[PDB]
Design a protein around this ligand. Structure first.
Ligand SMILES: NC(=O)c1ccc[n+]([C@@H]2O[C@H](COP(=O)([O-])OP(=O)(O)OC[C@H]3O[C@@H](n4cnc5c(N)ncnc54)[C@H](OP(=O)(O)O)[C@@H]3O)[C@@H](O)[C@H]2O)c1
Ligand SMILES: CC1=C(CC(=O)O)c2cc(F)ccc2/C1=C\c1ccc([S@@](C)=O)cc1
Length: 318
């Protein structure tokens, strides 16, 4: 497939280009899912405190470490700082809680989950009397400085951002006194939301892009029948058929050939294995351009409750 398993980040570390997603993976199933993934070759797991399943993911990681199926140095564990913890004095604790839950002493990568900070408290989405999200007066630059401290304290090897538009990425890159550049911007990306502008921009700066919801997140809670469906798109199934692969495998191989990292989620053992079997074939440049042609700027994750937040990322073109 002419395809290396890892790429180089701007912190000097290598990141496996294929990871296991864990959003929506039920806590009673995610431990098995992660164990199976490690058994069949995954070395990169994507996590978040807001997913509420980090403890159970941690159980799997710890068993595989204890059993010497894999060494810690071979794993690449990613988590994300939730929006209610953007305050300077809350970032370390949030990171430590994630570390404790995952049963790790460091993260390979820690991302600001969204550019939008919310009021701190027990609620992940604090709403006013009217149902609008209650912002915090923290800005992304001070949050970034807090993230940089995590590196200097040994808690995380790399820091990054997620759902940042190109102007927000630029704000960080131009932050006065910037100490560490974002290593990664994790964004939604698939044939219905191809992200050429943002990807090219990030890559030109040495920022690696991770593509999330690469299968179109068919299990997203807000899905409706009228929504397009990547996995059922006959045009994509045709390309898969031509290559004797599954539609999902094509959808995973797609971002890989764009020098993106990709993190398909599954709790199904058979699909976990299938999804990893994407290093044995190549999409043609024609295949790639054809898949790109399907773009319709359609977002699974639009964060509709925060469209008035000053830092809402999706008003901008890219
Ligand atoms: N803000 C953010 O940074 C953000 C936002 C969204 C997602 N993410 C990350 O990206 C990960 C992946 O995105 P996602 O969870 O939104 O959706 P996704 O990976 O595009 O799709 C997951 C869905 O696809 C199904 N599936 C997986 N493999 C399949 C296969 N081979 N054939 C048919 N169906 C298959 C899964 O079913 P089963 O599980 O039942 O097998 C699940 O319903 C997330 O888990 C999360 O880690 C991050
Ligand atoms: C896009 C999205 C994701 C994926 C992500 O951020 O990784 C997510 C993950 C969670 F664990 C919880 C909520 C969300 C979410 C959007 C969202 C959902 C509900 C609400 S309340 C209005 O019902 C508001 C926003």
């Amino acid at each position: 497939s002419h395809m290396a398993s890892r790429l180089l980040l701007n912190n000097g570390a290598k990141m496996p280009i294929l990871g296991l997603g864990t959003w929506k993976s039920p806590p009673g199933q995610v431990t098995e899912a992660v164990k199976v993934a490690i058994d069949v070759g995954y070395r990169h797991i994507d996590c978040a405190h807001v997913y509420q399943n980090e403890n159970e993911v941690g159980v799997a990681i710890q068993e595989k470490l204890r059993e010497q199926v894999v060494k810690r140095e071979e794993l690449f564990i990613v988590s994300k700082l939730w929006c209610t913890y953007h305050e300077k004095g809350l970032v370390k604790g949030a990171c430590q809680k994630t570390l404790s839950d995952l049963k790790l002493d460091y993260l390979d990568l820690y991302l600001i989950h969204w550019p939008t900070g919310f009021k701190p408290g027990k609620e992940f989405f604090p709403l006013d009397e009217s149902g609008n999200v209650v912002p915090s007066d923290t800005n992304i630059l001070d949050t970034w400085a807090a993230m940089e401290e995590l590196v200097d304290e040994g808690l995380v090897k790399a820091i990054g951002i997620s759902n940042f538009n190109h102007l927000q990425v630029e704000m960080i890159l131009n932050k006065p006194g910037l100490k560490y550049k974002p290593a990664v911007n994790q964004i939604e990306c698939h044939p219905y939301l191809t992200q050429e502008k943002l990807i090219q921009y990030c890559q030109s700066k040495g920022i690696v892009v991770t593509a999330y919801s690469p299968l179109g997140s068919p299990d997203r809670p807000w899905a409706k029948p009228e929504d397009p469906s990547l996995l059922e798109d006959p045009r994509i199934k045709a390309i898969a058929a031509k290559h004797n692969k599954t539609t999902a495998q094509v959808l995973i191989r797609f971002p890989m050939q764009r020098n993106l990292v990709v993190i398909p989620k599954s709790v199904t053992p058979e699909r976990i294995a299938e999804n990893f079997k994407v290093f044995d074939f190549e999409l043609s440049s024609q295949d790639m351009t054809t898949l790109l042609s399907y773009n319709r700027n359609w977002r699974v994750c639009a964060l509709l409750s925060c469209t008035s937040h000053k830092d809402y990322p999706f008003h901008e073109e890219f």
